[PDB]
Amino acid sequence: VHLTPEEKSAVTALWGKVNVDEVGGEALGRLLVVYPWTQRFFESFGDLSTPDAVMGNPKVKAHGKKVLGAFSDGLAHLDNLKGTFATLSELHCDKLHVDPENFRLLGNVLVCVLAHHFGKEFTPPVQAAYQKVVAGVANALAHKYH
Amino acid sequence: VHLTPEEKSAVTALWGKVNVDEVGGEALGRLLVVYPWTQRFFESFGDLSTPDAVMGNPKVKAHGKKVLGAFSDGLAHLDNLKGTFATLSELHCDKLHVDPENFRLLGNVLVCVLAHHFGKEFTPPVQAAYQKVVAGVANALAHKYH
Amino acid sequence: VLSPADKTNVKAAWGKVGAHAGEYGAEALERMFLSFPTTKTYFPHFDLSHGSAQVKGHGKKVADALTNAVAHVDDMPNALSALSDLHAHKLRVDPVNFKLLSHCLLVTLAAHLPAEFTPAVHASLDKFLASVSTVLTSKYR
Amino acid sequence: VLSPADKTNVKAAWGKVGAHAGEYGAEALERMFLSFPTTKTYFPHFDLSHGSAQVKGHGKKVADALTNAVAHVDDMPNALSALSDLHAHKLRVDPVNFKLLSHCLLVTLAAHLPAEFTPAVHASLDKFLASVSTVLTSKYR
Ligand code: HEM
Ligand code: HEM
Ligand code: HEM
Ligand code: HEM
């Protein structure tokens, strides 16, 4: 990871304005609306037949929280994303069997949600920093696969 | 995804039976045949209008050689490829303006060549190692871009 | 393959962009060059400074074709053919980048269209941009 | 898009596979699981060890599907009708993967059909496998 003091600060100050539970569910849902094949991992979640069925699925919103929650504690360890997501990486591989490509997809969905919520504030230079972040996390969650 | 001792001492042994000159020219060659657009960086190489014209093209053969040369010299810094190519990455980015994907594609063509030459000798276990290699080389070469 | 609902969402979200096409076109490019450095290797002859006349100029042209792809969304392959020939025989831009610019376009539209950038529209806009890209690389080999 | 030449190079190369289909098939897979471990996340139910009975069988299916695709290269879409639905609606493999299998398919063919694997033929197999990889994913969304 290569974040300069500047983009590090930017990434924290904007995330201090962020509602983690409302966005975790905003991002997990869009991820399942835009790239439908991802529902492959959520058969037990119920009805996912329409955009509103997905966005409003209580199980989807309940999960997006623990997801962006972990991703949120990860931002306090931007110098150690590898070990931070060490245990989560092992689980998504050995037990959940989740193609890592998906973490890459959630990362872009998130970025789209950040820009959407903060509007103009999510300037070009701010996006650049975040892209680095999601790339970092996605790669730390993929690290332990074998 | 670093190489295991057994993989390093497998890459070596196989490479030792490689004709860098021919394979470099065969690889860069096929690269301009399978992915036409990569010919954008070689407008002055002359005739490339066909598969035989490019494969039999002297300037292509030559460059295929030089290129694998640097690559060949690389299989010795397998623990710091990132450091070996810092000046070449810094270079391919600043002056030549080459999109790093090409490093990925060439590597792709390389694996097919190495397979084409050794046949049954080019084992799934060996391919895996070389994939790591090629993948590694691609990364370092891109690392210094900005 | 876009659907009736897709095309509705697209014409809807893009139609709103209206006279800000050029401007938004330049922003996506500025977002892409900063977020994905490697993409600048195709514009060695460009001044990439914030608001360069080149970027602003290339921004309009981009958005103009998209604005045009929208008007013939049921015949894009023919509406973008001159542009597709271009990217295949001259610029020869590697395919992997289109997805990069497409993301930045979504991101740009997300910042400007807070009311219309709904999950549904977003999804549809992703299929549109992906559909356009596929057309621009349709004649690569 | 496949030219009359690409089709000719294909029928020729693959037709030379004969009964080695199930064999090269299994092989293309084994290669893919070793080179690209993440592809193993779609077979938690398969034995992925060398000589696995499931890999062999699966190897054969994948092969016969290609044979069929070749025999109807002119109109692959309908030829792979069911198969696309399968991956689109059930298997749901991320499109990123198809490129891996394909590459492994080329490597495999190279190390098994040295003669006919000329640059041209190589270039034709590539466009081919991508054409297939596109049909299979055409109905994803
Ligand atoms: C920012 C990236 C992500 C983070 C930080 C993350 C985090 C988590 C956490 C903390 C758990 C629960 C641990 C447990 O059940 O013991 C989990 C479970 C899971 N994750 Fe991820 N995940 C991420 C992305 C994804 C993506 C994009 C998918 C799928 C497309 C996915 C699919 C799953 C599934 C299937 C479960 C199991 C849920 C259940 O049934 O309880 N995750 N993830
Ligand atoms: C295996 C990875 C590669 C390595 C290690 C590599 C190495 C080299 C080397 C040693 C040079 C000479 C630099 C100098 O003059 O100091 C060079 C030049 C260059 N490379 Fe790369 N290269 C690689 C892949 C590629 C690929 C795939 C392309 C794109 C098709 C490319 C395009 C160029 C061009 C156009 C030049 C300059 C040509 C000239 O000066 O006539 N390289 N490369
Ligand atoms: C939404 C997808 C895209 C569209 C609609 C598109 C459209 C265009 C248009 C209309 C032009 C102007 C051509 C003319 O003046 O007739 C152009 C030029 C160009 N495009 Fe594309 N393009 C797309 C994606 C890409 C990507 C991904 C890259 C780079 C990573 C790229 C690189 C170029 C370059 C280098 C030029 C030359 C511009 C100049 O020299 O001023 N394009 N494109
Ligand atoms: C070259 C493109 C591909 C072809 C030609 C292909 C072909 C097939 C065929 C013929 C079947 C048999 C369905 C039946 O029994 O009726 C199948 C099953 C399957 N495919 Fe695909 N496939 C392709 C790529 C992929 C990729 C990229 C992956 C994974 C990385 C994948 C994962 C699966 C899985 C897991 C099954 C289920 C097998 C089972 O349950 O036993 N496929 N595919």
Author numbering:
A (entry chain D), B (entry chain B): 1 to 146
C (entry chain C), D (entry chain A): 1 to 141
From the paper:
P50 of purified HbA or HbS in the presence of 2,3-BPG along with S1P revealed that S1P decreased HbA and HbS-O2 binding affinity in a dose-dependent manner.
In both the binary deoxyHbA-S1P and ternary deoxyHbA-S1P-2,3-BPG complexes, S1P was observed bound in the central water cavity, with the phosphate and the amide moieties located in a pocket formed by α1Lys99, α1His103, β1Asn108, β1Tyr35 and β1Gln131, while the flexible aliphatic long chain snaked toward the β-cleft making hydrophobic interactions with α1 Phe36, α1Ser35, β1Lys132, β1Gln131, β1Ala135, β1Val1 and β1His2. However, while the ternary complex showed S1P bound in a symmetry-related fashion, the binding of S1P in the binary deoxyHbA-S1P complex was very weak, and only one S1P binding site could be unambiguously fitted in the complex (α1β1 site). Note that the same concentration of S1P was used during crystallization of both the binary and ternary complexes. Each S1P-associated interaction in the central water cavity was essentially intramolecular in nature (i.e. make interactions with only α1β1 or α2β2) and suggest that central-water cavity bound S1P might not contribute significantly to the stabilization of the T-state structure. Consistently, the dimer interface β2 F helix/β2FG corner at the switch region show some significant positional differences, with that of deoxyHbA-S1P-BPG further removed from the R-state.
